[PDB]
Amino acid sequence: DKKWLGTPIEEMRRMPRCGIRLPLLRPSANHTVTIRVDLLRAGEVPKPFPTHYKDLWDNKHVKMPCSEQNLYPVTAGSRWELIQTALLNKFTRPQNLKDAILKYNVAYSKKWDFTALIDFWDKVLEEAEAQHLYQSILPDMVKIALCLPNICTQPIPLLAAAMNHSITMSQEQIASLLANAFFCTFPRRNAKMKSEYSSYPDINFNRLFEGRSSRKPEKLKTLFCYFRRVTAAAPTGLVTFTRQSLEDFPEWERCEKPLTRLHVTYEGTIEENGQGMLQVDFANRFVGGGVTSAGLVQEEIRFLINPELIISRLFTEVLDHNECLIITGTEQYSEYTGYAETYRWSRSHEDGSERDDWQRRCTEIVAIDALHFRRYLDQFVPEKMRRELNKAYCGFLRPGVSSENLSAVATGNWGCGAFGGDARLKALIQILAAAAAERDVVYFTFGDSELMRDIYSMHIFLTERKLTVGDVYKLLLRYYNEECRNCSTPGPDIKLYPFIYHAVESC
Secondary structure: OOOEEEOOHHHOOOOOOOOOOOOOOOOEOOEEEOEOHHHOOOOOOOOEOOOOOOOOOOOOEOOOOOOOOOEEEOOEEEHHHHHHHHHOOOOOOHHHHHHHHHHOOHHHOOOOOOHHHHHHHHHHOOHHHHHHHHHHHHHHHHHHHHOHHHHOOOOOEOEOOOOOEEEEEEHHHHHHHHHHHHOOOOOOOOOOOOOOOOOOOOOOOHHHHOOOOOOHHHHHHHHHHHHHHHHHOOOOOEEEEEEEEOOOOOOHHHOOOEOOOEEEEOOOOHHHHOOOOEEEEEEOOOOOOOOOOOOOOHHHHHHHHOHHHHHHHHHEOOOOOOEEEEEEOOOOOEEEEOOHHHOEEEEEOOOOOOEOOOOOEOOEEEEEEOOOOOOHHHHHOHHHHHHHHHHHHHHHOOOOOOHHHOOOEEEEOOOOOOOOOOHHHHHHHHHHHHHHOOOOEEEEOOOOHHHHHHHHHHHHHHHHOOOEHHHHHHHHHHHHHHHHOOOOOOOOOOOHHHHHHHHHHOO
């Protein structure tokens, strides 16, 4: 039993080598750039643009904590002044930190539980570790949080529904924003019955501090590894966040494109073995899922080890069916073992990825959210299959870039587990989506050697028979019609792959 099958991974395209010459970075109607491009230099901290803080407090931009319009009824008082007063007190005990955060979140003093934070500081950390936390890490985090108006000087637009727009900001900017999120300073982002931001993910970290899950200390260790690194030595690179919406989706049944190449393996991971490839994040529609609360599977783990991803939650509206979020340049700061309730922070990670001409790490991650199926057979309904195909196609397609400048897609069992996806169907759907976008596929099955063999065998069967994307899609429609439509039991009589082999071999 070989550990990988298909095309050798050495034959797959990767960044930076496969990529187009980057155009000059510049701000434009569809590209917000929060730093001085003329001054961007390798190894130098980028300079914010503009030099002095400019505030927008409106329905199209992030509401910054340092806004003069961030007020609290006392007569209206300045919440930013209050945040400054609260956080510049020395912490020596965890109640100090809880009491600080609550000074400018009085409405949540009974609703927000800090049990996990108190327990991490008092009951998990050794004396010297706790001392380092409150003498060094937390005061450094305060100082970079309170530097926000000098660091993030340009209004950050919301990446709202249906927008095709990019934001490029510095890793240093992201660190200041994330320190603010830790201290729960973002206004209008807390209320359960909130309107404006009800369609946005949570950004403030208060739910990280609640409860007694044994995984909260591991999440906190992972995030403090990041905060220590970025407050000790300013990161020098940039990160781009791009919301993408497509109008025109394939007529799948009519698609004459051939399948592309496949490498499939039961060993390795997306983050390690997919270097330079388009890396799929198995997203929640609210990007990052429960990273800031109780989730700890594929998406949350990536958001924890690459915490710059977390700031997408500040500005990224819930994804509609035709949308994705593409993030380029995030850095890995931690290594980990395990998954969900076995997840453990292992050690600090020194990211060795090359940077591109915009000083972004050559790491491209796409958040595409699969559907959650209440019943197994729901996913074979043609509308639902088409929905998944179009979502993956939107995540993989790069309008205006030709095939040879596109890296392989590094993916795995997208939507399987809690969302109830069938791995064999979702693998085919990704294969078809990738074919339509003219990209090869590298597929990680994470210990499932039978699934590796099954995907390989189907892909090589369809390939040798020269079936097009349309031919294969028509086979999925036939499977639904013959085995799922008037099925009244929870599982079909015959499985998808066996059905396909029989349908093709007897035609």
